[PDB]
């Protein structure tokens, strides 16, 4: 039952996604903010890809960490082949979509993940930060404002449908995010946070450490 | 060509000329021979120009590639090894003509005494390497001259700006004896490039302080 | 039934794990302690991987011994490629997770094992010893205190949830361990014991022999 | 039914083992004794592997003779690669365990065999002779005293659980063995016997011929 | 049903064997006698392999003729590799057993054959002629006296259990054979006969022609 | 059902054979006569292979024309490798038997054909012309007198069991053949006829044209 | 080296010396240069000794291999072709140094007149071959001499023993002129080997009748 | 280059200079030519510097790799063999230029008499090896000189410190005749490196006792 | 190098010196050139030392490997063939420089008359071989001399100890003419190694009876 077969796959994956932790990214004044709950100190669900493009995913770790590498793999290569300025993250979105697409067909069990690639304009240039959501089955859509994935989204997503401050400040967007995240459930300085600082000269990625995090964090 | 690196109390400085010889006929007067590889590593490359810009560029990508992947930059030990491999995987070429010989300068943020954290690693055509531990090193057409002048002017190295002058003076001394090296061109306004590395990072020295420094040396000799 | 198929796999493996012997590792003053019941004199369930990283697994021997080698294989190579200081065990955790992950999908029957990779800071440096648990299905989690695997854990694990002395002494932790192990069942100088001595200059691994073992061993 | 599938395999194999002849090896004063019932004159179920390590198996001949070769194959190579003194039989146990382990998964029908690798200390050196039992499914265990396999073991094994003379003489152990073997059933000078003579300078293997056998053989 | 599957295979093959013609070989004074009923003039069921080793099989022709070649293939090679004197037929038995063993597992339908490899001592040397029976499933056994295969054996085999003259003459053994063969059923000079003449200098094979055959043939 | 599976195959093939046209070859004074009903002018069911060996088949054309080529392929090669005189048709029988044998196992659907290879002694030499029947399943048998295949044979075959003139004349054998062929059913100069003229110097094949055919043809 | 083959009424004879030269220094005095390939085929081989024993041995296996497989020995035509292939598949080697040149002698049990069933086939380094049809042929360091003596003594060939004497006399005549050929060594008791083939088969001629024959020739010349 | 190994009652000592010649122009004065491979094995390597640090480093990893895998260090016999393979698997290179020739010094913890457990194995460019059994050996540009001086001063070897002085004195004697060897540089404070192996293990001899030892020899000759 | 093998009534003896020359400069004085391959086979190897210890060692393993596999040792015929293959599969190397030439000595436990069961097989660089059937053979730098002396002293061979003396005397005679062979070193106590093979097996002849034998020859000549 090739048709019914595909439904089973979807299911299996969609389930795994739900039983995994929550991850959210959104557009703010200086770029894009990455925030996801993560008790671990070493196992990161958010990462740099290339100069101006960030990676964040939720699901089965070993599966998305693989893809994370593959991305960095693809990106670096592409930039050496042509030039740095010729990597887009819109590209990486295509790639991940292709890859996950293939997996969902060829591999025995499809990957239990949901991904997010985010780009924020080069140093001087000014452009609307772009977000992409790549699903387990290979489908791809781009949110202009914010992306939620992993666990139950409806409440966390709904909280944002309202709390989203179009041109938020870093501290303001973080506040909004952590609170919007608690909506699907706590929320301590024991989680993973990093941003794509459009303001940064070259490498627009910066992880928010433990001490400095507190300065911006939301009271509950 | 002449590239030279210097070790001073704060960290390391590296600077090389910009002449480009083809036969005994000038074919460039503005070549960037020294590049910043990453935050604490700068790399200069002599020999075939095609392999030169390719080493620097490719290496840099490999270093940053590791960091993005493993989440942490390589040990200075690793950085040395990667470059060393790269050089061996080019012996085939170098045998025939395409010879590219690097000189690595860096700051080990993990060094015991962060005032000796300045590092200079010279490289072997076959892929060998010795951590210099002697303050100065040079590679290229007139390196022999630089090293020999810089021998006398090393005592004078005291700090950043201090060392940098000795560097630029060696490059002037080199070009004065190696027709393939090329000293400071006033008439056209072309001066050797330089990079410094200290605990803060590696940054390009603006031609301003070099050009100024160059004239100091020219006048004092004059 | 791709979904139901996967449940059968889990089962088969989870069972094998249970019917196999018990293995425990924990964090103590000087590093990490490896202890597992093993009547054999030659077949070892605990082993060195690299300078500062240890391997311990329980399950079907020929299956984890394979992985044990592959680890040492991967580690050594990685250290020659870049440098000794650039192997992490967090790396090896990823690798094992990847490998077991693939096995659980591609191989006919999934591996009947559960693994533990442990790292303890380099000689001079001081850092919190880290423990990782890699399951048969490729899932990976890191305990900050102690890891139990093989046989029935609940009683052995529970004994530790209390008996765990945060900053134990070698002899104290061994005592705690052996007693905590008896909790799921004896416990003679006829078993396998080794440690990751953070204090050691380079190779931070040392197996505890028969005679010297007695000196530290717990009365029942 | 991946789980139920594996049970069928086990069965099929376990059965073949039973319907085949009986093979026993044990530790005695001068090393290890190999004895198995075998009417054949040419088809041998017991063999040398390397200097100080013996092979004995029961089951479907063409299957274990294959493995027998593979062992000798592996051993010789290993000894040329590094040195003679670096082959262990504990190694060969791993290999056979690996191999049979793979077969039991990949091959259509799993091998109907049970194996025994035995090592006895080098010439000068004195060490406790070691025995390993490798089963059809790849499981591996080491007996410190004696190993039984093929046919119905319980009676033959039980006879030994008592008749085992820890430090037996050659003639005494042979006596014990042949009698212990009759326990699961005769027992004439028409069977296969060889030993690992720890006393021997280099090649510690020697087959017990027909005439000299009689001198030591047990009356019934 | 991996277990039940194998039973079906056995069946299919065991059947084919039965519906095919009868073939018998035995030990006599001067070596080994090969006799099988065969109306054909060109399609031979008995053949030379190497200097002192004969091949005879019954079953589906195209299948055992293949194996017959493979043998000659293997033998010749082996003899060039090392020396003539180093081919044993005991070797070829292992090979056939291996081959048929594999077939019975890998190939869709297992070979419908039963084989016999026979060796008779070198010219000067005197040794007991040896016979080997290789079955469809890869099992291998060696008769010291005589081997029967193809069709219904019980009556043909039984006739021999008595009529077997341990040290028969050529003419005597042929007599015994043809008569023993009629026991499962005629028996005219229209069949295939050859022997392994131990007496022969090098090539110990000789086919018994039509005219000379009569001189030794049994009246019914 | 590996056993039942094979029965289905046999069936499918055996059926195709029946629903196809009739082909017959027989031994006569000057060699072998090839006659089969064939309305077509270009699609030939009878062909030359090598100097003294003929090919005739019935069934699905595209399948046996393939084999026909392969034969010619094999033959020519063999003759260049060694010598013309070293091709036997007995060889080609083996080959076809091997090929069809493989097909019947490996290929999805087994070939719907039945084949006949016929040899007739070299020019000077005098020898009994030989006929071989190769079936769809790879079975091979040699008739000393005549071979029938394709459609319903029993009546055509039966007609010959009596009408067969051991040492017939060309015209006599043709008469016998065409009449024997009508027995399973007309029979006009609109069919395919050729012979292996033993009398011919080298190439012992000759097709019987339309005009000259009439001179020998049987009245009904 | 010198191998020679002779055709007489019954069949063919072939005999070759046993000297082995390395430079101009003897390195063998007992080499079997002629071998029986199968029942009706004998083959002698000159040039590199390593390829010599290998050709003979390997060929022999291939012939018997065909027989065991197809149930019938090859045509004499086939036997010739197989050997010819073998020689071509060695041109690569022969170019560099490893030159091995066969001489085939045989009895066609299928020949029209079984008194001309004696065959001699000489071979080409490239893989060529001509059926000699002239009674005698020789290959080797001194074949040139043998062939030229044997030219005169061919009329004398009448039967087996008759022909064999002419063979042994050519080998003596050869060795008398080719320092690399080596005649009969009385002092040590070493005499050329020989093989005869007639309708009955091919058999080694025992040194007895050769040694005897040798002395005949030595005395008669003396 | 000159590396030298000595066998004394306790075990073995090995020491080599640190000069590095490129043409007849100094290009190093601090090269580590001797390395500890594992607990009881030290290895020195002469010839191309690129292959030198690579052999030592890679070998060491292979030895420890076996131990981690099989749970027990290799036989001394094995250790010898592995190194030997490595060397053969480099003939291709060495033929063209990249020649690297090791010298193995070790302590067989399994040796019969643990006072003869000192081992010295010299190696062949092709991959050969002889266990020296003669107390001293040397490889390199001036090994010829060392071996010949150390021939006279061997009687003087009594114990650890005793043997070590003879080693350092050969290295001095070598550099005094081989311009490519380089003796002790007082002016700059650079002295040959050394490693000792006894039942306890292999340890680097601190320059202190070497430098001291060096002056002894310089003064006594003075 | 000079290896020599002798055939006496009981079986065979083989002995070769231990000199090792590199240029015209001694580089060894203790090399084992003769090895026992299995119970009844001993093999000596001349030419490149790297390929020497490798042939002997590897061969030995292959022989024993067959035995463990097939349950019976190879025919002597087989043993000869395997070794022969090995030699051919090294022609590539030998062409460039790595030439290794074996000499096989053995006892055929299956020989007709077990007093002629002594075998000597010399080998061809290309992979050829002749069973010597002449009692003595030698390979190496000074084999030419040994063979020519041993020619005179062969009558004297009567039994084990008898033959062995002739062997050691040839090796002495060789070294007396071939500067690359090296006779018995009294000053240092180094004597040629030897192996004997009889119906009982093959065993190393202890230097004792050799050293003794050596002095015999030295004094008698003196």
């Amino acid at each position: 039952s090739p048709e019914q077969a595909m439904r089973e796959r979807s299911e299996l994956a969609r389930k795994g996604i739900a039983r995994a932790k929550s991850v959210v990214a959104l557009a703010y004044a200086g770029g894009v903010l990455f925030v996801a709950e993560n008790p671990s100190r070493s196992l990161q669900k958010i990462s740099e890809l290339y100069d101006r493009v960030g990676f964040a995913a939720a699901g089965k770790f070993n599966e998305f960490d693989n893809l994370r590498r593959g991305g960095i793999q693809f990106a670096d290569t592409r930039g050496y082949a042509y030039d740095r300025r010729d990597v887009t993250g819109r590209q990486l979105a295509n790639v991940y979509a292709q890859t996950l697409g293939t997996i969902f067909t060829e591999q025995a069990k499809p990957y239990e993940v949901e991904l997010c690639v985010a780009e924020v304009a080069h140093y001087g240039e000014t452009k609307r930060p772009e977000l992409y959501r790549i699903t387990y089955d290979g489908s791809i859509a781009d949110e202009p404002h914010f992306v939620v994935m992993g666990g139950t989204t409806e409440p966390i997503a709904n909280a944002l449908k309202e709390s989203y401050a179009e041109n938020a400040s870093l501290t303001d967007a973080l506040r909004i995010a952590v609170a919007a995240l608690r909506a699907g459930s706590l929320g301590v300085a024991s989680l993973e946070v990093a941003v794509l600082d459009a303001n940064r000269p070259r490498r627009a990625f910066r992880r928010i450490t433990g001490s400095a995090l507190q300065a911006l964090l939301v009271d509950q | 060509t002449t590239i030279v690196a210097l070790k001073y109390p704060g960290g390391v400085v590296m600077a090389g000329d910009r002449r480009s010889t083809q036969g005994n006929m000038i074919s460039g007067r503005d070549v960037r021979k020294v590049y910043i590889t990453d935050d604490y590593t700068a790399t200069g490359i002599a020999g075939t120009a095609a392999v030169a810009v390719e080493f620097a560029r490719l290496y840099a990508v490999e270093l940053e590639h590791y960091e993005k992947l493993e989440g942490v930059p390589l040990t200075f030990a690793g950085k040395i090894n990667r470059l060393a491999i790269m050089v061996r995987g080019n012996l085939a070429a170098a045998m025939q003509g395409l010879l590219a010989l690097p000189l690595l300068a860096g700051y080990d943020i993990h060094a015991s005494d962060p005032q000796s954290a300045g590092r200079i690693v010279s490289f072997d055509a076959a892929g060998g390497w010795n951590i210099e531990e002697e303050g100065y090193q040079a590679v290229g057409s007139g390196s022999l001259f630089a090293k020999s002048s810089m021998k006398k002017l090393y005592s004078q190295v005291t700090d950043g700006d201090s060392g940098l002058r000795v560097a630029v003076e060696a490059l002037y001394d080199a070009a004065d004896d190696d027709s393939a090296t090329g000293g400071p061109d006033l008439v056209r306004g072309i001066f050797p490039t330089a990079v410094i590395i200290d605990a803060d990072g590696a940054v390009d020295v603006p031609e301003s302080r070099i050009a100024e420094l160059a004239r100091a040396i020219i006048e004092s000799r004059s």
Side-chain angles (χ1 to χ4, degrees), chain B residues 18-62:
Chain B
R18 32 238 329 276
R19 171 98 99 203
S20 167
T21 179
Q22 173 197 83
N24 60 175
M25 171 201 121
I26 291 91
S27 55
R29 28 191 46 141
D30 55 302
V31 204
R32 303 256 139 153
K33 295 172 174 177
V34 182
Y35 297 82
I36 304 180
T37 322
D38 76 347
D39 296 304
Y40 298 94
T41 325
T43 177
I45 17 71
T48 311
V51 204
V53 196
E54 174 199 13
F55 270 161
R57 168 185 182 137
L58 160 66
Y59 183 33
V61 181
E62 205 198 308

Side-chain angles (χ1 to χ4, degrees), chain A residues 58-104:
Chain A
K60 203 177 187 280
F61 181 86
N62 76 284
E63 300 199 312
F64 71 74
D65 181 65
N66 196 292
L67 296 165
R68 189 187 60 80
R69 295 178 152 271
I72 302 178
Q73 251 302 310
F74 171 70
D76 281 306
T77 300
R78 231 285 191 312
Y80 184 52
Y82 310 103
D83 190 61
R84 321 223 66 162
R85 233 87 110 272
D86 310 14
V87 180
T88 77
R90 192 271 297 279
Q91 278 176 201
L92 286 79
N94 275 306
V95 184
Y96 285 124
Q98 214 60 75
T99 306
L100 287 174
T102 310
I103 293 167
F104 191 77

Side-chain angles (χ1 to χ4, degrees), chain B residues 209-220:
Chain B
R209 196 166 52 163
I210 301 170
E212 176 190 311
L213 252 166
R215 295 205 184 83
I217 329 293
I218 308 167
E219 287 160 356
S220 71

